[PDB]
Design a protein around this ligand. Sequence first.
Ligand SMILES: Cc1[nH+]cc(COP(=O)(O)O)c(CN[C@@H](CCC(=O)O)C(=O)O)c1O
Ligand SMILES: Cc1[nH+]cc(COP(=O)(O)O)c(CN[C@@H](CCC(=O)O)C(=O)O)c1O
Lengths: 335, 335
Amino acid sequence: TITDLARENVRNLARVWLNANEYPTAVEFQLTQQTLNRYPECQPKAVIENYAQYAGVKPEQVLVSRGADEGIELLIRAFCEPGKDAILYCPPTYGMYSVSAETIGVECRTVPTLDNWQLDLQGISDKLDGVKVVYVCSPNNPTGQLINPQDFRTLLELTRGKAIVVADEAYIEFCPQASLAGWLAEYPHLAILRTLSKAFALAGLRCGFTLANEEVINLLMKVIAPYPLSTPVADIAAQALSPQGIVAMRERVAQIIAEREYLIAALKEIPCVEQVFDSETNYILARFKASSAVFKSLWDQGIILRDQNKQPSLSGCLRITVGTREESQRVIDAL
Amino acid sequence: TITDLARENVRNLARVWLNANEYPTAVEFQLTQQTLNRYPECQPKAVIENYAQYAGVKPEQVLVSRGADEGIELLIRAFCEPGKDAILYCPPTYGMYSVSAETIGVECRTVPTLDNWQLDLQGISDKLDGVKVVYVCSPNNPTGQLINPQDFRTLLELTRGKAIVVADEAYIEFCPQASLAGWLAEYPHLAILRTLSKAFALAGLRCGFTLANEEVINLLMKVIAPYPLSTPVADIAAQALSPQGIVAMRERVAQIIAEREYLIAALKEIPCVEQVFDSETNYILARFKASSAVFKSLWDQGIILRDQNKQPSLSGCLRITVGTREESQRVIDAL
Ligand SMILES: Cc1[nH+]cc(COP(=O)(O)O)c(CN[C@@H](CCC(=O)O)C(=O)O)c1O
Ligand SMILES: Cc1[nH+]cc(COP(=O)(O)O)c(CN[C@@H](CCC(=O)O)C(=O)O)c1O
């Protein structure tokens, strides 16, 4: 039957919302370009330049795509040979790295991080043979911490002329000083993923970026879809990336950080809450006493969180996205 | 260097506009959903149901994606094993079939059509070994003619339990009675590509569809991106696919067909115009005397067409998209 014609790997491979790391409030935007009958630019000029000014890079070092998710796929499609090359990631982390490789047909090499979520440098150096792309989320999802920049430098020296190192900075707006965007001059093999889905409050736009050196970007352009971005998305993205939009964005980051600190202080006092881990993002990882029990309870109360109990070493943990003061108080009361 | 890390195939692999088959006039649309902070549905309910009513299929037989282009890729990603499986197409036709396979790493089997653009059935039957997906554009781009339904039935009998047959109906709105959408009940391996880019006048939305049986659609869902469509695109798409939107669309089809007939009558009278081929779409293929000479001339006059002189058997031909009466008269006068 039809199913027998599909590739073997393809055969084998939810919706108070505080589970997807979205900004809790909707920032309104309206269209300004009524040119829907014509195909859009392959890489919207206004979007690429506005983002390059914001990120502090050159326009030729930016690539716009359908979220950071498409960015993850592009890197594998351009550098990894199916059945020959490997990808490497360090659990517990964002699940789309292995899903894309599994869907495409590339092998996964996993080197779990140390107990403090930091990189197991010696383990990575031992499993690099055959690896073409290394993904590192910093700050990490779901744990919330930054990877020591000194260890990142070591990772970069290890992969020079061997593999591409991709730093997922989907949550960098929360700790802007920790960005590796300035390292592009020093490292040809460094690529960074960015997005408008979190701090920018535009998850519905499906708009992301890849920051890398001209050489890498030019290669990715060869594997990307002819018109990866719609005109309405490029329209709103340029409005959100204007100087006033970047000011409003920072106001949002501020509000979330303040609220995050309140939520962390309150959670520590709660008995069932065994441990609250520090974060430099818009979510909090916390180990609970009988996590799935409390998860179901809140779930039945209309408080949607994200269970991480199945993740390597995240037994008993739930990931809570930071929302409004009313939503935080709602989770506090329920606990 | 960086380039040496890329896959071998990746290393090796323009903007009066009448060159992209777009509707000449912009139909205005405005947003109605200010929920941009939240991730969109993976498959927008309103879009899938409105399109299913229009196309006359069941909602479970529809898949919405970023244009018919993503639809072409999905089929190869789900059914073709890189380095093992093959794709088959019949030149001269739409160029994205071979580009997607070349980018992914799948081999192309080409069986050029007969002199009248119809399918070389015996040639296809001889090159089917190893083929997993067969693409057939009907009506064809750039020639404009329909593939004999009797030959399509033969193609379908030849591929039963061997390969998926995909009918590209990107231009079907111009000859709706010629659609193979009703054949889904009879053929499990039949898939159809649709789009909002032409008659629907929404090329800027990057919104397309794949019509197939539940089994095929469920497999494609496994290889597609988590949120392939943005909220603003799903918003406008549902507005355009409402009963009133389908009525307005048909008005557009009517206007284009009438204009097409005018443009064909006028072109025949012109001396340099050697031959004008009949079309069931929104473009016209025509063989000219010194085609690149006339192409450059019009190009220098701000009249942009599409050169097909390099396509197999399309030597001396230019593809002219049907626009407004003023644009047609502008091309007539220039000739
Ligand atoms: C680390 C990380 N990297 C990349 C992305 C991709 O973002 P985008 O630009 O939207 O493609 C995400 C979103 N992961 C969130 C997905 C939520 C959802 O799917 O819904 C998450 O983990 O909550 C990440 O958490
Ligand atoms: C036969 C055919 N099939 C599929 C598509 C894909 O459409 P979409 O839904 O937008 O992805 C196109 C557009 N081909 C036009 C592309 C114009 C452009 O790239 O610009 C064309 O040939 O003019 C086709 O001509």
